[PDB]
Amino acid sequence: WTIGIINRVVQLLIISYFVGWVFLHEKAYQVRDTAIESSVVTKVKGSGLYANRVMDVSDYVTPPQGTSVFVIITKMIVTENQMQGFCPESEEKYRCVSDSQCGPERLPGGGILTGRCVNYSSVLRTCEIQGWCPTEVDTVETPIMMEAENFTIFIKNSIRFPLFNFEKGNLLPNLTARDMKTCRFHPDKDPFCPILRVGDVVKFAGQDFAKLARTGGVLGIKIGWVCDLDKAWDQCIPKYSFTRLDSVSEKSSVSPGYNFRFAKYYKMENGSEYRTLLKAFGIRFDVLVYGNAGKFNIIPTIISSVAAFTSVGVGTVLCDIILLNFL
Amino acid sequence: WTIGIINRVVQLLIISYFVGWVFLHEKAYQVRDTAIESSVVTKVKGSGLYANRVMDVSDYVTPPQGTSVFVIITKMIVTENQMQGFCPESEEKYRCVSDSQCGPERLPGGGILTGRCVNYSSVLRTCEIQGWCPTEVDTVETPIMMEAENFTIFIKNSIRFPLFNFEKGNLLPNLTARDMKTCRFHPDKDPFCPILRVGDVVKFAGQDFAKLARTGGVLGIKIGWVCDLDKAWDQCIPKYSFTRLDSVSEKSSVSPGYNFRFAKYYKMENGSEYRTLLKAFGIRFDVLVYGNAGKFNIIPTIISSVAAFTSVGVGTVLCDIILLNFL
Amino acid sequence: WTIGIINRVVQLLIISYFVGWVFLHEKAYQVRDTAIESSVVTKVKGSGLYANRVMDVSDYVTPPQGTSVFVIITKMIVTENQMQGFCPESEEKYRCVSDSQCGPERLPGGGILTGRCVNYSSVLRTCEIQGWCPTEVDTVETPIMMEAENFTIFIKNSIRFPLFNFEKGNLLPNLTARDMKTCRFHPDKDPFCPILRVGDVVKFAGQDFAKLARTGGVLGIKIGWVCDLDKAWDQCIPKYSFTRLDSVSEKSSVSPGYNFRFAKYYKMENGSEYRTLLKAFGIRFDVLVYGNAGKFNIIPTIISSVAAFTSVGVGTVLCDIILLNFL
Ligand SMILES: COc1cc(C(C)C)c(Oc2cnc(N)nc2N)cc1S(N)(=O)=O
Ligand SMILES: COc1cc(C(C)C)c(Oc2cnc(N)nc2N)cc1S(N)(=O)=O
Ligand SMILES: COc1cc(C(C)C)c(Oc2cnc(N)nc2N)cc1S(N)(=O)=O
Ligand SMILES: *[C@@H]1O[C@H](CO)[C@@H](O)[C@H](O)[C@H]1NC(C)=O
Ligand SMILES: *[C@@H]1O[C@H](CO)[C@@H](O)[C@H](O)[C@H]1NC(C)=O
Ligand SMILES: *[C@@H]1O[C@H](CO)[C@@H](O)[C@H](O)[C@H]1NC(C)=O
Ligand SMILES: *[C@@H]1O[C@H](CO)[C@@H](O)[C@H](O)[C@H]1NC(C)=O
Ligand SMILES: *[C@@H]1O[C@H](CO)[C@@H](O)[C@H](O)[C@H]1NC(C)=O
Ligand SMILES: *[C@@H]1O[C@H](CO)[C@@H](O)[C@H](O)[C@H]1NC(C)=O
Ligand SMILES: [Mg+2]
Ligand SMILES: [Mg+2]
Ligand SMILES: [Mg+2]
Ligand code: NA
């Protein structure tokens, strides 16, 4: 019967359409490159106020080179004019009653204990230590640079897909509403402006500057390079996203936030040495570049095609058995 | 007719050859690892002259650890002995006529404005600012360290393909014409010597040292690790390439080059604090490691094979219809 | 004969089992993501002794931010109070007999030669140089901070597979025997504790602290994220490994170990400038994050399936020919 080949042919057509849409969707005809070779250069603009002193970019940004990971310092704890000597440490966990409990077996990873149980103050007696005296007092409260909210991070980024040798940057003037310098990134109003506001990146991360600034944190400015290299070059476009990477699990057991120490090293006119020890809290920024590019290639196209052919060839036989048996 | 199976068999053979060469070419029988786990350690050698002072590696290289991204400083702008205070800023964009136009709404991302319109000089009246005084004057011209051309970057690089747990380095003495220390990288005369000359990397990048040095720039020393792990180990060889990553698009709207500030922090015998503010221009180097390794594996070999079988099985039927119909 | 379809059917079943186990093993039904987007933050705890001075984290860790690559300084060579001037260099390779052999053509990549052959000491006459005087003497022996063995590296790591948008961290309290702070990483007794002991990482690397400390070295703390995202989330677990990346090939020709210089910059009450030049040896740590995630996906499942179907369809025909011919 000719209805055998009309039923057949119709069968073939419908099944072929399903399969074809599925494969063409996922671009299974494409080899993919996922090893994006990115380079990132950043610049911070702004000046803040702290105590009775002004902080400029050289004061609160570290490292100064503009690497993919940098810190804006928002709050700091100063221990000025330390000198090598012996002094009672200030952290309660060094508490003692006798010099018997200041031996080497106590806090083995801690400081260098001299062995003397000495009176730090009238209310607390701690083991004495040799090292930078006086010891740090990391249990006070200090101001935070509010002006950090109005600082700007300018993110130059140049990427290359090496499989296809396709290199492009995120400085796209034909894709920004405003001139390069005047523009600021809004995920909707200007998604390709490379100048981000610190408070913005804080808010897209969905976190509060006051709290973050105080305790420190790690924000990720993610640069994504999903591209179809079958398509025109003007279509390989970077999409920015924002997240808080020091995300706070409910369990905790470790102090959240971000802080690190470093010293400004001075030497006396006398000759002896003395430093200013700084415990710094601020927002670390991690520009995380992702990308993946697809291109037509003879081998994945052939493999995808053969897969389609055979899959339909079986689909019509099983559809014939299900139809003929009618259940 | 036996000519049916001679025509058939010949058909089969030719088509099979085409397909086989295509698949064997792309090594479709291989699973590929593209997540190269690289570690890079660099060392700069050389000394330059600047003003009436000598710069050695500790003076002009930053950071000193030898990371994958480091800067050779070729020109710098010194603002010596800054102190916290009030002074007219020097940048014309702060110009004012009355203190009415030095309110907070002016240059909100700029410095900390005191509110006074003051006479910086007799020809320019700018808003006064609180901060490091005197302000910077970033519109002058200074010399550049020419000797930077004769500096050398020694690039130790150790990579590992984790899918295959295949780790190798780029220090290959059996692959260099000269002893390790005496050798210098030439893309032809010695493509595996890990000691590169700064001016060389500048020239392979195709850019002029004088200009670059003056304005700063970002060069990429790309280490490529394309390897067939089916093949012998002696064949996993690194290939170096060189490119300028701060490439200059015609549109511009942002100053090209590379510069960053940082301060040397001093404290008076009196007690007050004072810094030397340095605006640094130089060549940043970005060692960008790429690699991808192939290996035979049962699954991609089976999939590739099945693809070949079916593709020929259809190719001979369609060749039979085209031949039989003769058009 | 019904034995034709019993032999057939049995054939089909056995071959189908072989193929099915092979494909299901390699999870060929999965698309794989190998572009792990990781962020690493590290903290060092401990204090060491060096000469008659104490070193704390700000003194011996660099950079202080806690990046994926940081150095614990174990031994250092101090050249105190350098000043710009002219002096005979101390390295024997500058040896001369007359000022004729101190011209510009000698050691062109070396220092700035003045041109005078001068008597450094009574036993050695070297070319004079302009630069930081006195010159460095990098041929002496100094102590090493032994307490570095009892220091701890705490490795916070947050990863994201962007293809599947699957983000997880290595801080897993339900996976550690001990509270987060008290725990220490043992590859068996606690493989998910993020606090590693320096001497531990040295020993898992299989190297001796005394020797390493003295000469410097590069250790890699590898964080591996092999995960089946078909499987439950609690199964995406990080596995740590440890290796020495400045591995010593037998050929050598370059000094092993790890060292870098940097200067502490001071200025006189007089006004002139003078630095302390430090040649630092220590253990650099490279947290190298790898990961690869698999997930079921319609396209690789279809391709794998079709491959299986056709492979069995041919396997039974060739098994029929081998059986029928009986050899
Ligand atoms: C410091 O200079 C740079 C540096 C970079 C890299 C190194 C991040 C850069 O990346 C691009 C280069 N080319 C285009 N089309 N887009 C880019 N995003 C642009 C400049 S530039 N010319 O100053 O603005
Ligand atoms: C600082 O020391 C290093 C460091 C590295 C890594 C960390 C970059 C190194 O990488 C190799 C190690 N092994 C081989 N075969 N090739 C390499 N390229 C070699 C030395 S070394 N032994 O001083 O020259
Ligand atoms: C500095 O703070 C951080 C930072 C990070 C990243 C930036 C490395 C971090 O990574 C995780 C975040 N969330 C989970 N579940 N696991 C993690 N490993 C945890 C903390 S935290 N909350 O202080 O301990
Ligand atoms: C580390 O601390 C232990 C005490 O817990 C001590 O016995 C050991 O000697 C220390 N290691 C070094 C190298 O000092
Ligand atoms: C140098 O002088 C300071 C006080 O000005 C003193 O505390 C210190 O001990 C002196 N240095 C030496 C080595 O005596
Ligand atoms: C940022 O600048 C605007 C002026 O453009 C000002 O109104 C605002 O208060 C500033 N933000 C902070 C946190 O000071
Ligand atoms: C310290 O002395 C300098 C001049 O030598 C002076 O300008 C400065 O104001 C003094 N510091 C204080 C706190 O008075
Ligand atoms: C580099 O050294 C050579 C001598 O080997 C010298 O002729 C040349 O002038 C030097 N280059 C520069 C820029 O000084
Ligand atoms: C400053 O004084 C030191 C000695 O205290 C001297 O060596 C140096 O030359 C002086 N500086 C100048 C510029 O004379
Ligand atoms: Mg403390
Ligand atoms: Mg300025
Ligand atoms: Mg030397
Ligand atoms: Na197939």
What's the CATH code of the domain at C308? Answer: 1.10.287.940
Length of chain C: 327
Exposed/middle/buried for C318, CB within 10 Å: 0-12, 13-18, 19+?
A: exposed
Of C130, C267, C286, the CB nearest to B266: C267
Please choose, from the candidates C43, C78, C69, C72, the residue with its C-alpha nearest in 3D space to the C-alpha of residue C59: C72
Q: Does C37 lie in the same domain as C164?
A: yes
C143: helix, coil or strand? coil
Comparing CA positions, the residue from A162, A133, A196, A202 lying closest to residue A36 is A162
The Cα B254–Cα B38 span in angstroms is 33
- 3-class DSSP state for residue A212? helix
- Classified as helix, coil or strand, C246 is coil
Strands A166-169 and A152-161: antiparallel
A153 φ, ψ to 5°?
-110, 120
Q: Which ligand is nearest to the CA of C215?
A: 2
Probe site for chain C from A24, A106, A267 (most C CB atoms < 10 A): A267
Cα separation values, C235 from C24, C172, C189, C226, C231, Å: 19, 12, 19, 10, 7
Residue bearing the CA closest to ligand 9, atom 14:
C272
Of the candidates B202, B228, B258, the residue with the CA atom closest to the CA atom of residue B62: B258
Distance CA B251, CA B254 (A): 9
Nearest to B220 by CA among B197, B201, B198: B201
The residue assigned the tokens 């004969």 is C1
Is A301 found in the same domain as A263?
no
For residue B249, count other CB atoms closer than 10 A to its CB.
Answer: 12
DSSP B230-258: TS-GGG---EEEEEESS---SS--S--S-
CATH assignment at residue B81: 2.60.490.10
Q: Are strands C152-161 and C195-197 parallel, antiparallel or unpaired?
A: antiparallel
What is the count of structural domains for chain B?
2
Ligand nearest to the CA of C23: 13
* Residue minimizing CA distance to atom 3 of ligand 8: C108
**What range defines the domain where residue B175 resides?**
31-295
- Residues, beta carbon < 5 Å, ion ligand 10: A 136, 138
C252 with C131, same domain: the answer is yes
State how far the Cα of B225 lies from the Cα of B294, in Å rounded to an integer. 11
Binding residues of C for ATP, by number, are: 43, 45, 152, 255, 259, 261, 279
C298-325 helix and A2-26 helix, angle to the nearest 10 degrees: 120
Cis peptide, bond prior to residue A134, ω within 30 of zero? yes
Examine the domain organization and report whether C9 and C112 are in the same domain: no
Residues 6+ apart with CB under 8 A from C294: C27, C30, C31, C32, C227, C228, C229, C230
**Is residue B171 a contact partner of residue B194, using CB atoms and an 8 Å limit?**
yes
DSSP reduced 3-state for A253: coil
CB B230 within 8 A of CB B295: yes
Q: Torsion-angle region of residue C108: left (phi > 0), alpha (psi -120 to 50) or beta? A: alpha
Cis before A187 (ω within 30): no
Cα separation, C264 vs B11, in Å, equals 79
Q: Cα–Cα distance between C90 and B311 in angstroms, integer?
A: 74
CA distance A72 to C70: 19
Residue B113 tokens read as 């404005």
Residue C295 Cα, ligand 12 centroid: separation in angstroms? 55
Q: Is the peptide bond before C134 cis (omega within 30 degrees of 0)?
A: yes
Who contacts B170 (Cβ-Cβ below 8 Å, separation ≥6)? B155, B156, B157, B158, B159, B192, B194, B223, B238
Task: Please state, in angstroms and as integers, the Cα–Cα distance from residue C97 to each residue in C17, C56, C101, following that order.
Answer: 84, 47, 7
C-alpha to C-alpha distance for A292 and A166, rounded to whole angstroms: 11
Burial of C239 by CB count in 10 Å (0-12 exposed, 13-18 middle, 19+ buried)? middle
Give rounded-to-5 percent helix, strand, coil for chain A.
25, 40, 35
Strand, coil or helix: what is A39?
strand
Q: Which candidate, A103, A104, A102, A97, places its Cα nearest to that of A127?
A: A102
Locus of tokens 């073939």: A12
Cis omega (within 30 of 0) for bond into A143: no
Cβ-based neighbours of A96, under 8 Å, separated by 6 or more: A102, A117, A125, A126, A127
Q: Could you tell me if A39 and A21 lie in one domain?
A: no
CA quadruple A292, A294, A297, A301: dihedral sign? positive
Is the domain of B160 the same as that of B128? yes
Q: How far is the CA of B113 from the centre of ligand 9 (A)?
A: 39
- CA B44 to chain CA mean position, Å: 16
Number of H helices, E strands in chain C: 5, 15
Buried b (16+ CB within 10 A) or exposed e, A188-221: eebebbbbbbbbbbbebbebebeebbbbbbbbbb
Same domain, A302 and A290: no
Indicate whether A227 and A309 sit together in one domain.
no
CA separation for the pair A145, A56 (Å, rounded): 11
Provide the H-helix boundaries in A247-297: none
* Lookup result for tokens 């179907």: C309
- Distance separating alpha carbons of residues A38 and A45, to the nearest angstrom: 23
Closest Cα in chain B to A54? B131
Strands A113-119 and C239-244: unpaired
Ligand 4 mean position, distance from CA B271 (Å): 41
How far is the C-alpha of A102 from the C-alpha of A128, rounded, in Å?
8
Residues of A in contact with B133 (CB under 8 A): none
Cis preceding linkage at C63, omega within 30: yes
Q: Resolution of this entry in Å?
A: 3.4
Does C269 lie in the same domain as C220? yes
Q: Which residues of B14-33 are buried (b: 16+ CB within 10 A; e: fewer)?
A: ebbeebeeebeeebbbbbbb
In three-state secondary structure terms, A123 is: coil
- Exposed / middle / buried, residue A56 (Cβ in 10 Å: 0-12, 13-18, 19+): buried
Q: Which of A58, A156, A266 sits opposite B263 (nearest CB)?
A: A58
Which chains are within 8 Å of C by 3+ CB pairs?
Answer: A, B
Specify whether the CB–CB gap between C221 and C40 falls below 8 A: no
Contact partners, residue B293, CB within 8 Å, separation at least 6: B32, B33, B161, B163, B164, B166, B225, B227, B228, B229, B236
Experimental method of this PDB entry: X-ray
| A150 plus A17 within the same structural domain | no
Name residue A322's amino acid: I
Same domain as A36, residue A26: no
Residues B266 and B273 sit within 8 Å (Cβ to Cβ): yes
In which region does residue A127 sit, left (phi positive, over 0), alpha (psi from -120 to 50) or beta (all else)?
Answer: beta
Q: CA dihedral defined by B295, B299, B305, B308, rounded to 10 degrees? A: -100
Q: Return all residues near A211 (Cβ < 8 A) that are at least 6 apart.
A: none
Nearest by CB to residue A64, choosing from B246, B260, B288, is B260
Is B327 in the same domain as B263? no
Helices A298-325 and C298-325 meet at what angle, rounded to 10? 80
